[PDB]
Amino acid sequence: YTFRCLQMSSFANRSWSRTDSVVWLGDLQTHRWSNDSATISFTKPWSQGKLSNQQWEKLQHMFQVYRVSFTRDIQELVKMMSPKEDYPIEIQLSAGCEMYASESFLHVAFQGKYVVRFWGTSWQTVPGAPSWLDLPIKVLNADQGTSATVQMLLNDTCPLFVRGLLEAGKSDLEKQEKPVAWLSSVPSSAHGHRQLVCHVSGFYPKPVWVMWMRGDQEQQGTHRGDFLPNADETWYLQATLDVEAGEEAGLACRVKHSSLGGQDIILYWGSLHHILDAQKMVWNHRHHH
Amino acid sequence: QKTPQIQVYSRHPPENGKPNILNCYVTQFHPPHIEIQMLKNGKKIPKVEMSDMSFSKDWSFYILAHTEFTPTETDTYACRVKHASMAEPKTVYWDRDM
Amino acid sequence: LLEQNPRWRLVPRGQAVNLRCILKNSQYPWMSWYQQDLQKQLQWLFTLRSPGDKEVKSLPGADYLATRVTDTELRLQVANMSQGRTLYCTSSADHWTNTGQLYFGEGSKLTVLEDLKNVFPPEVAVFEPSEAEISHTQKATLVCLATGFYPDHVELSWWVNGKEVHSGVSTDPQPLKEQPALNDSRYALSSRLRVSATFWQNPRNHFRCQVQFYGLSENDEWTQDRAKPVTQIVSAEAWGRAD
Amino acid sequence: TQVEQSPQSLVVRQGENSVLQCNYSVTPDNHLRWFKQDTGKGLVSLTVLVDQKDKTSNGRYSATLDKDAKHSTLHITATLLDDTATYICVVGDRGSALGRLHFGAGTQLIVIPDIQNPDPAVYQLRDSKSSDKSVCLFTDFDSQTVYITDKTVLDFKSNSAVAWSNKSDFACANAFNNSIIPEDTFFPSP
Ligand SMILES: CCCCCCCCCCCCCCCCCCCCCCCCCC(=O)N[C@@H](CO[C@H]1O[C@H](CO)[C@H](O)[C@H](O)[C@H]1O)[C@H](O)[C@H](O)CCCCCCCCCCCCCC
Ligand SMILES: *[C@@H]1O[C@H](CO)[C@@H](O[C@@H]2O[C@H](CO)[C@@H](O)[C@H](O)[C@H]2NC(C)=O)[C@H](O)[C@H]1NC(C)=O
Ligand SMILES: *[C@@H]1O[C@H](CO)[C@@H](O)[C@H](O)[C@H]1NC(C)=O
Numbered sequence: 001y002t003f004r005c006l007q008m009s010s011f012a013n014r015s016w017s018r019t020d021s022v023v024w025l026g027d028l029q030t031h032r033w034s035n036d037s038a039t040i041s042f043t044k045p046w047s048q049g050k051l052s053n054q055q056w057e058k059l060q061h062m063f064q065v066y067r068v069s070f071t072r073d074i075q076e077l078v079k080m081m082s083p084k085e086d087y088p089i090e091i092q093l094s095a096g097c098e099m100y101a102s103e104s105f106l107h108v109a110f111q112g113k114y115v116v117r118f119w120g121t122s123w124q125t126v127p128g129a130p131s132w133l134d135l136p137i138k139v140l141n142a143d144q145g146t147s148a149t150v151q152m153l154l155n156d157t158c159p160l161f162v163r164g165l166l167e168a169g170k171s172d173l174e175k176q177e178k179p180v181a182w183l184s185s186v187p188s189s190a191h192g193h194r195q196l197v198c199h200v201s202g203f204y205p206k207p208v209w210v211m212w213m214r215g216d217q218e219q220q221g222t223h224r225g226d227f228l229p230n231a232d233e234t235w236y237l238q239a240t241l242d243v244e245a246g247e248e249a250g251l252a253c254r255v256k257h258s259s260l261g262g263q264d265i266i267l268y269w270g271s272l273h274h275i276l277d278a279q280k281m282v283w284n285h286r287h288h289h
Numbered sequence: 290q291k292t293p294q295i296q297v298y299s300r301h302p303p304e305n306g307k308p309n310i311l312n313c314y315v316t317q318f319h320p321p322h323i324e325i326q327m328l329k330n331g332k333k334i335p336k337v338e339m340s341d342m343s344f345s346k347d348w349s350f351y352i353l354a355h356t357e358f359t360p361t362e363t364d365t366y367a368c369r370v371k372h373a374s375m376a377e378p379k380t381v382y383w384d385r386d387m
Numbered sequence: 388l389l390e391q392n393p394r395w396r397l398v399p400r401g402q403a404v405n406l407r408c409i410l411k412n413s414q415y416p417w418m419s420w421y422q423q424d425l426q427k428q429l430q431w432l433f434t435l436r437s438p439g440d441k442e443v444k445s446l447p448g449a450d451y452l453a454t455r456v457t458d459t460e461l462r463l464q465v466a467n468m469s470q471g472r473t474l475y476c477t478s479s480a481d482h483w484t485n486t487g488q489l490y491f492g493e494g495s496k497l498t499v500l501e502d503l504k505n506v507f508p509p510e511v512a513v514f515e516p517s518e519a520e521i522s523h524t525q526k527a528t529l530v531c532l533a534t535g536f537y538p539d540h541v542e543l544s545w546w547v548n549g550k551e552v553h554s555g556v557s558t559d560p561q562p563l564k565e566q567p568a569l570n571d572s573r574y575a576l577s578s579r580l581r582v583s584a585t586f587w588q589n590p591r592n593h594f595r596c597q598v599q600f601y602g603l604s605e606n607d608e609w610t611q612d613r614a615k616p617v618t619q620i621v622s623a624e625a626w627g628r629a630d
Numbered sequence: 631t632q633v634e635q636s637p638q639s640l641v642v643r644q645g646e647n648s649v650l651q652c653n654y655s656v657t658p659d660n661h662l663r664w665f666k667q668d669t670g671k672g673l674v675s676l677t678v679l680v681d682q683k684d685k686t687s688n689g690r691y692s693a694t695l696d697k698d699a700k701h702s703t704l705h706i707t708a709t710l711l712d713d714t715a716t717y718i719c720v721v722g723d724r725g726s727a728l729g730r731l732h733f734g735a736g737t738q739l740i741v742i743p744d745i746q747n748p749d750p751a752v753y754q755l756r757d758s759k760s761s762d763k764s765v766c767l768f769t770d771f772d773s774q775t776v777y778i779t780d781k782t783v784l785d786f787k788s789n790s791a792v793a794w795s796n797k798s799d800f801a802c803a804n805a806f807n808n809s810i811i812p813e814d815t816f817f818p819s820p
């Protein structure tokens with residue numbers, strides 16, 4: 001499990017700026033901190049972890065000062081860059097820890113390119129960073145107070161709070177939802193070829209196995225798609241196979257998942273089930289890709 | 290600048306008539322300011338709920354917008370996205386076959 | 388150290404002023420401006436680090452424009468003054484606490500006047516010790532009186548036998564208004580030199596009270612009957628009596 | 631205002647103790663400074679306070695700070711006459727040069743001398759040049775007690791006032807007629 005707090009800071013001009021945050025434990029969102037809101041919102045019941053109200057309040061106030069101080073700090077340092085004040089400016093922050101013994105991290109990106117990180121006791125510029133960053137970094141490093149509490153956060157507070165989230169989030173981190181799969185088809189970009197499509201949807205946890213098969217033989221032309229999210233924190237995936245016409249016969253999409261026991265999902269092309277599924281999908285085909 | 294990737298897909302096996310949930314998933318864009326609408330036949334669908342914006346390991350943003358819908362042989366759904374990296378707003382149509 | 392210029396300036400209501408802050412050591416580069424109003428309330432104005440950084444800010448009742456021209460020079464143009472300000476220049480390194488320090492300049496006192504003909508130099512008078520005081524206390528006190536001047540910037544000193552003395556002197560903290568109800572009133576200031584009776588009674592002992600006054604420059608237009616009131620010294624003197 | 635000092639004005643006899651209060655609401659409070667400004671002069675740093683529960687000794691000065699109560703006090707043990715000044719409490723916004731200072735209104739300190747065996751008297755002094763202008767000197771009143779000068783403090787230290795006026799029949803005996811005057815004041819005929 002990899003805990004990560006993400007921060008999106010937009011600086012449009014001299015006056016306008018916003019900053020929003022989201023917190024992830026694995027592939028589950030735990031917190032949301034909108035610019036508009038004074039407090040940090042919970043997205044799950046177990047989002048407080050094992051901390052007690054007093055310990056949480058202290059941390060939230062710790063972050064509330066941070067958000068306001070950060071926005072001022074950036075708008076003064078921006079005056080040191082080349083060229084002077086290069087608006088608009090985006091700042092991104094990724095801070096968390098990975099679980100095993102643990103490993104905390106804090107990385108910073110400027111205009112989408114990762115340039116600074118916290119390491120040991122100070123701020124450091126990563127290889128290939130703009131040379132104008134040297135001056136801002138020196139001033140930030142002069143602030144013992146920030147330096148010392150960041151250290152506390154990364155070294156001590158991240159691992160501890162996560163270890164709590166993990167314990168009180170176990171029930172939700174263990175749940176198993178069954179994949180549902182269905183077949184479709186599209187013309188291929190090559191003449192006389194067609195693209196078979198196997199849609200796998202509604203599964204959790206994320207790890208999955210999907211292949212086109214001639215019984216024994218896995219079809220090496222299988223192209224696994226990207227993992228696309230569902231609104232209910234489940235997952236959607238598709239696998240495609242490019243075939244020549246009259247070669248679809250005997251093919252099947254196989255799906256292995258932790259929620260299925262050993263009982264894999266097998267869907268055969270042209271099978272009695274597939275036919276009836278297909279008759280329910282029909283449509284005029286516009287505007288098709 | 291990084292131009293958005295738009296992917297449109299249904300939550301459940303898209304049988305006509307039966308209620309389903311349509312997802313428009315936008316990826317790989319920078320800066321994070323972005324306007325997304327989900328369209329039915331051309332008119333804007335009034336209640337389109339959205340996830341919070343997050344970013345990935347390559348520092349590019351991603352957001353998920355979604356709404357309930359009932360698919361029909363004739364009715365068409367799309368997803369329009371306005372971003373600075375684009376001159377004109379990109380509109381992407383749902384293709385259940387894709 | 389940190390040179391602040393000019394030290395003092397008269398500003399005819401509705402004109403600008405140029406202020407400089409030349410810094411002697413480049414190791415303390417974080418130059419910033421602080422304001423202190425006539426009610427002694429201090430306030431931060433601007434904080435500039437890079438050469439070429441210019442910033443604007445509007446405050447009751449004076450408008451500012453501060454630029455950092457070079458790594459050593461710091462400017463501040465002050466316009467549309469309604470009421471008096473005094474401006475302080477500070478520099479520190481990156482750290483400014485544990486490994487200090489933070490340094491303050493001598494400041495620039497700006498005074499705003501409506502009319503120039505309102506500037507008057509002070510009349511000075513030394514009043515000789517009381518013969519009753521000498522009997523009763525065996526000490527002799529001279530009082531000096533600087534009156535009828537405007538504005539309020541005067542520096543007073545005592546000179547016994549051609550050399551300055553601090554021993555036995557107490558001068559008023561601030562000048563007082565002669566006509567208290569009026570805005571363009573003139574000021575008056577007093578001082579006391581208290582010496583032993585024996586020392587005053589020496590005929591060879593010479594007592595002088597000088598008052599430095601800060602008024603007009605040689606670069607101010609003036610055609611009026613009374614004399615042009617330049618930055619000048621006015622004094623009064625007395626020798627001792629035996630009886 | 632974010633930094634409240636109290637009181638606005640304070641009076642102590644030379645040699646006694648004096649305490650000044652400062653309550654703030656600046657966030658974040660990184661450090662606190664005390665400054666001393668002699669009237670008509672620049673600021674002089676008395677001490678800087680850094681930690682959550684801090685304390686520092688500067689010879690005759692001493693200050694404490696509690697960040698929990700956003701509160702600080704300054705003590706001057708055995709006060710001198712030269713301690714007559716304005717005392718400014720200020721808060722550090724950051725722990726680096728990115729920070730800004732926030733200043734309290736100042737507490738005005740007035741030190742009045744310990745005059746054992748006072749010698750109250752009002753004398754008339756005449757102009758050295760002739761003539762015939764004159765002035766009144768009120769000397770050696772203890773500090774409980776027409777253009778009248780505010781009472782000043784000498785260093786044998788004495789409280790003394792000066793009054794002058796240009797009016798037909800002044801006169802010195804009744805010059806401080808709007809004043810609390812000792813019942814044993816010497817009024818020599820002029
Ligand atoms: C952190 C992870 C640990 C896990 C526990 C948290 C889980 C709960 C979920 C929370 C979700 C909220 C989203 C959080 C956003 C992710 C980022 C978190 C890391 C933030 C760093 C924490 C800094 C805290 C210190 C702080 O507020 N500093 C403040 C105040 O400091 C002042 O006040 C203090 C008193 O409170 C001290 O007295 C100090 O001496 C004084 O100067 C100080 O002002 C800092 O400088 C703020 C900046 C920090 C951002 C660094 C950016 C570096 C990149 C610069 C390069 C870009 C180039 C520029 C053009
Ligand atoms: C947080 O952990 C880091 C290591 O990740 C510590 O940084 C070390 O600091 C010590 C002494 O200050 C140095 O000798 C090491 O070289 C540092 N390590 C690295 C990798 O730079 C840091 O001290 C820890 N902070 C706290 C509060 O425990
Ligand atoms: C700052 O940015 C916002 C949004 O980008 C805009 O509405 C506003 O006009 C801008 N202000 C300026 C340019 O002063």
Ligand SMILES: *[C@@H]1O[C@H](CO)[C@@H](O)[C@H](O)[C@H]1NC(C)=O
Pocket residue numbers: 017018019035036
């Ligand atoms: C974001 O919140 C801050 C208060 O923390 C506010 O001053 C700022 O104007 C807000 N920006 C937007 C775009 O809402």
